[PDB]
Each structure stands twice: as C-alpha cells, then as structure tokens.
Amino acid sequence: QMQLQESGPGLVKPSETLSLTCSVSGASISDSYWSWIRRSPGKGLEWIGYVHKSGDTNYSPSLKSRVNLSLDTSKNQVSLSLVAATAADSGKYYCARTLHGRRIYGIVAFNEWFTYFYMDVWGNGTQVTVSSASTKGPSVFPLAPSGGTAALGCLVKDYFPEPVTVSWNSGALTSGVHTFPAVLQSSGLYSLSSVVTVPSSSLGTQTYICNVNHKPSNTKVDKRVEPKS
Amino acid sequence: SDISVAPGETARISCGEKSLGSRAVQWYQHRAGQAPSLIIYNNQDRPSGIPERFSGSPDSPFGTTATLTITSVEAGDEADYYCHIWDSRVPTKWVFGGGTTLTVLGQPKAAPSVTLFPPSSEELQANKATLVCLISDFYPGAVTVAWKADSSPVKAGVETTTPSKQSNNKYAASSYLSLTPEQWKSHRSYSCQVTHEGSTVEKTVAP
Ligand SMILES: CC(=O)N[C@@H]1[C@@H](O)[C@H](O)[C@@H](CO)O[C@H]1O
C-alpha cells in the first residue's frame, strides 16, 4: 500500500552538496516521523537523522552537523541535504517511515521513561557516489537470441556511476527477466547485462525492447532486440 | 560473528553491549536483494506478519545482551540481522549493531544456467567486441570462469563479477571478454567455461 521512492543525483563532487528526495504515496508525511539510513559498501547501517511535521528533529552527531532533513506537505516529500560531500559519504541511502514508542520503566513524573524509534517501512534506496570523475552514459547493445525457449538481452556498456535500470517492453514484461549486477571494470567504468528467457515460438511474432535509464548522465535509451541471420 | 544452522534447528544472534538500564531493542532483517525490514521492537514485540518463531529478549535482568532467537529455521531466514538498542542509561546509538549473516545449511544444489552471447553488429560497427557470459540461479555461490580462444586459454581482457546472492537464495554472476573485431574473427571459436561444484559447463560461439 505504502511506497517510498527516493531519488538523487547519483554522482556528487567532493565538497559539494548532496540532495536526496523521498517521494511518498499511500501515506501522508504528516502522520509520522521520517528517517534516512545509509548502508555503506559491505555491511552496516547508519541512522542519519529523523524529521517530523511538529519539528521534533535530530541527527547523528557523527555527521558533524552537515545534514538537513525537511518536509514538503504539498509534494508529500522528505528531503535530505548533505553538505560538504566526502568519499565516506558514498553508499545506498534509504528513506524510511519511522514510528515512535515509549519505554516507561518507572514513575513518569520522575522522568523514568524515554522515547525510542523503529523504522517499519523502508524504500529500496538510491545509490550515491562521491567523485570528481565525470559521469559517462552507457552504450546499449542488443544481445540477439539464437529447451523450447530462447534467451535475448541487452548489454549496457561503460557507464559511471551506478546505477542503471532496465525494464522490458515498458514494464509489461517481467516474467523471466534477469538483470545482472554490474561488473566494475579495471577502467573504473561499469557494464551490466539484462537477459530475458522467452518461448521460442514467440521470436517472430512478439517484439522485445529493453528500456535503459542511467539518470546521473540523463541517458534514456530503448533497444529493440530480435533474432539475426 | 556469522552463523550457519541446519533447517529446523534454532539460531541465536547476540547484538550490542550488555545493558545498564532499561531498554527498548529493535531488530532488523536484511535479506539479500531486499530493503531491510523491522521484525522486532520494544524488545520482543512483533509487527503483524512476523512469525512467532522469531523472538527478542527481555530487558530484565540488567547487564544482559540483546539476543534474537529464530526457531524452526528455514531457507527464507537467510539474511543479515541488526539490532537497534535504546538504553535508559546510555546516550542514543545512531549506528545499528550486528549485521550477523545467517546461513541455512542443506539447501539443494542448483546448477548454473549459462548463456554466452557473441558481440553485436552494432558493437562490431563501433570497432569493438565483447563476449557476454551470463551465469544465474546457481547454489552454492562459489564459481570459477575460464575463457578459451579456440582451445587456448585466455586471461587477458576478462572482467568477471563476484557472485551475488539473490532474493531466492541463489547466486548470479557474469563474465566479459573484450576483443578487437580482428581478434574476435581470428580464432575459429570462443568458449566460456563455468565450473560449479565439480562440474564445468562449456558454451561456445563462432563468427
Ligand atoms: C516501496 C517500494 O519501493 N517498493 C518496491 C517494490 O514495489 C518492488 O517490487 C521491490 C523490488 O524488489 O522494491 C521495492 O522497493
């Protein structure tokens, strides 16, 4: 029911400002707290800060007062600003609906209770890379098809930074789609392949287009892939 | 520290330092290829949807450690597990604790599905050439990939990914061989050899 789509620049230059946005549907941003979490390459999860319409807002002191969380009620969005981007700021950033509770272990009047927070709904998060390197859009190539089934796909070549998305037939085709994790080339550039397993009998009749989007470079490409001679 | 348990036994993960005051520990599950999800809060409360076979610990007595307990372990339980500890006697913790991976032993082996594509007319037209070898839905996750020009082994020009665990607990990987159009056409054929659990699959393409 509730869906959180966080979006960002997908590249930021050192010592410049990171601006991320979390789009919310199925839920009013006014009904709860909202958090951002960042996972670094490898494991670990770091709660960045939380914001509320009433303005109960706090931040991880490790971020050295570099972050701002805001809300826009008209756009139903949450915002994240990260001033002075450094390499250690890279990773995947999550937007998450945050709820509060109260641990009451003694007599309230003697202040013997505290507020805790849990994050029950997380977005899929958005990738952020800090680098002085310039973005490079991918080149897209068709991978033509040859047990009663055939595999065809798209090669997404030499892009930077992550990530790129691949849909088939504008989203209409998801059954049997494998979009492979990118390879990091010793050139510093990324490639990836998207392959779909299809019924052989459909090779002539049905049309197959891969929709590649690499936002950091503003690259949007459709590739039609069909069997060759 | 990571753990591996056989199906139908129980796993215990302990996170964070020993308590001082009263606590409200939350537990998070991060499956491969998924967003993290809340599975326990207020020490041992369960969001609807979380089975009873997941349980956190009480905050009494003090000086104990937050321990997540999963009984009747099943394949779907394979994930990384973090905790968020709130302690009345300690300043708020902004980094999650744990991240211990749970491996569920004894899942069935899955043979890799291997697909090898030759370079496209378009790429060849841009005076470049890339062999594409796709390796999917295999378990366990350890694999090795070798390339062959005709019968000669090729290590130069190869980029091969580290296997990555999918949502269904299987792995995917891929390997690329960069050629010049002239190299691609010089050998009579090229092969992609994938070795997994004592078996080697060979896929071949020719110009
Ligand atoms: C709230 C939200 O973003 N939901 C999406 C879900 O629709 C999608 O199917 C899934 C793919 O794994 O990724 C989630 O992040």
Please list the alpha-helical segments (H only) found in chain B: 121-125, 181-186
Domain range summary for chain A, segments of one domain joined by +: 1-132, 133-227
Three-state SS for A204? coil
Domain range summary for chain B, segments of one domain joined by +: 1-106, 107-207
Residues A210 and A192 sit within 8 Å (Cβ to Cβ): no
The answer to whether the A1-132 and A133-227 domains have the same CATH topology is yes
In sequence order, what E strands does chain A have?
3-7, 18-25, 33-39, 46-51, 58-59, 67-72, 77-82, 91-104, 113-122, 126-128, 139-143, 149-159, 165-168, 177-179, 183-184, 190-199, 209-214, 219-224
Gap between the Cα atoms of A4 and A27, Å rounded: 10
Cβ of A174 below 6 Å from ligand 1: no
Chain A residues in contact with B41 (beta carbon < 8 A)? 101, 118
Cβ of B95 below 6 Å from ligand 1: no
Chain B residues in contact with A123 (beta carbon < 8 A)? 35
Taking the Cβ of residue A185 and every Cβ of chain B, the question of whether any pair is shorter than 8 Å is answered with yes
Three-state SS for A166? strand
Three-state SS for B103? strand
Gap between the Cα atoms of A80 and A73, Å rounded: 15
Gap between the Cα atoms of B43 and B20, Å rounded: 15
CATH number of A133-227: 2.60.40.10
Fold for domain B1-106? Immunoglobulin-like (2.60.40)
Please state how this structure was obtained: X-ray
Residues A91 and A10 sit within 8 Å (Cβ to Cβ): no
Q: Which residues contact B99 (CB under 8 A, 6 or more apart)?
A: A43, A44, A45, B30, B80, B81, B82
Contact B117 A155 (CB under 8 A): yes
Chain mean position to CA B92:
31
Contact B172 A178 (CB under 8 A): yes
Gap between the Cα atoms of A180 and A166, Å rounded: 10
Of residues B115, B137, B109, the one with CA closest to residue B198: B109
**Buried (b) or exposed (e) across A189-219, using 16+ Cβ within 10 A?**
bbbbbbbbbbeeeebeeeebbbbbbbbbbeb
Beta strand B3-5 with B97-104: parallel, antiparallel or unpaired? parallel
Gap between the Cα atoms of B4 and B23, Å rounded: 28
Gap between the Cα atoms of A151 and B114, Å rounded: 10
The answer to whether the B1-106 and B107-207 domains have the same CATH topology is yes
Q: What would be the CATH architecture of the domain defined by A1-132?
A: Sandwich (2.60)
Taking the Cβ of residue B30 and every Cβ of chain A, the question of whether any pair is shorter than 8 Å is answered with yes
Helix (H) or strand (E) holding B132: strand B129-138
Q: Length of chain A, please?
A: 229
State the Cα angle at A128 between A127 and A133, rounded to 5°.
125
Of residues A219, A223, A214, A217, the one with CA closest to residue A168: A223
Beta bridge mates, A160: A136
CATH number of B107-207: 2.60.40.10
Beta bridge mates, A167: A211
